[PDB]
Amino acid sequence: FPKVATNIMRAWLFQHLTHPYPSEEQKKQLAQDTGLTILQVNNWFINARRRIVQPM
């Protein structure tokens, strides 16, 4: 489900908040867990990092 994919990636993000950049291997593992493509996983984390630092 979409909520499952979102919660997988959010959990990874908050466990890696000081280095929120998945390696190529970690992207493949996340793609498998979420059912998303590698490209979609990377897009999600690009957006997450942008949103985190976005001005209040």
UniProtKB/Swiss-Prot annotation:
Outcome of gene disruption: Mice die between embryonic days 11.5 and 14.5, showing internal hemorrhage, liver hypoplasia and anemia.
Region Interaction with DNA, annotated ranges: 21-51
Tissue spec. comment: Expressed at high levels in the lung with lower levels detected in the heart and brain. Expressed in pancreatic islets (beta-cells and non-beta-cells).
Positions of the DNA-binding region: 1-56
Cellular compartment(s): Nucleus
Spans through the membrane: none
Induction: Expression is coactivated by retroviral integration in BXH-2 murine myeloid leukemias.
Disease: Meis1 serves as a site of viral integration in 15% of the tumors arising in BXH-2 mice that develop myeloid leukemia as a result of the expression of an ecotropic murine leukemia virus.
Family from the record: Belongs to the TALE/MEIS homeobox family.
Protein's job: Acts as a transcriptional regulator of PAX6. Also acts as a transcriptional activator of PF4 in complex with PBX1 or PBX2. Required for hematopoiesis, megakaryocyte lineage development and vascular patterning. May function as a cofactor for HOXA7 and HOXA9 in the induction of myeloid leukemias.
Subunit structure, as described in the record: Interacts with the N-terminal region of PBX1 to form a heterodimer which binds DNA including a cAMP-responsive sequence in CYP17. Also forms heterodimers with PBX2. Forms heterotrimers with PBX1 or PBX2 and a number of HOX proteins including HOXA9, HOXD4 and HOXD9 where it acts as a non-DNA-binding partner. Also forms heterotrimers with PBX1 and HOX proteins including HOXD9 and HOXD10 where PBX1 is the non-DNA-binding partner. Heterodimer with DLX3. Heterodimer with HOXB13.
Designated name of the protein: Homeobox protein Meis1
Source organism of the structure: Mus musculus (Mouse)
Residues of the full protein shown: 279 to 334 of 390
